[PDB]
Amino acid sequence: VIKAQEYRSQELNREAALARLVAMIKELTTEKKARRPTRPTRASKERRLASKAQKSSVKAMRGKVRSGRE
């Protein structure tokens, strides 16, 4: 339901009503582009693995030096 009364002229008002209709239908039927989910970059995955391996080596060196070769 549109009410076009901007103008003293009925023909101007009729075209304004049709223009409002077209603009509204366009804005309401335009489809939002879908958002595909992104993953972590494989560079970051390798970073995770590398930090993990480095801390692994440090923790292996740390702590308990048992066996004692004695």
Next chain:
Amino acid sequence: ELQEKLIAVNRVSKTVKGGRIFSFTALTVVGDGNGRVGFGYGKAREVPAAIQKAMEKARRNMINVALNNGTLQHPVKGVHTGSRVFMQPASEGTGIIAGGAMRAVLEVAGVHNVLAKAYGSTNPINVVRATIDGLENMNSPEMVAAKRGKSVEEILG
């Protein structure tokens, strides 16, 4: 003849231009089980060499403890570098009730019954030093009766 005990073996690092130089520090206590106890730190590139160095240092840094039939003479404190050790004599069936690095010191020293407690830092090197500090802080009744010109009975009577 002389009981030896390895308390801890640690891996230390030096970080040179090429990378890390990993070394091993030992920590041992020797003692005749009759009031003579010493500790040796020792450190080398390999663990058995570190242990041998520590044992050879402990054998020559031994002190004398005046203990009363396998226990202490009186409650004693032994602070060294944030490690506060509290030892206290116990009856002849209690056993060594002591934490790590105190247990070895007391066992090689010949204290068979003791109620010990470690406060503050429990770093083994400083705990061993603190235990030995307390054990030499200990006084015998004869030592007290010699300090205060007085009979042993007049003291402990």
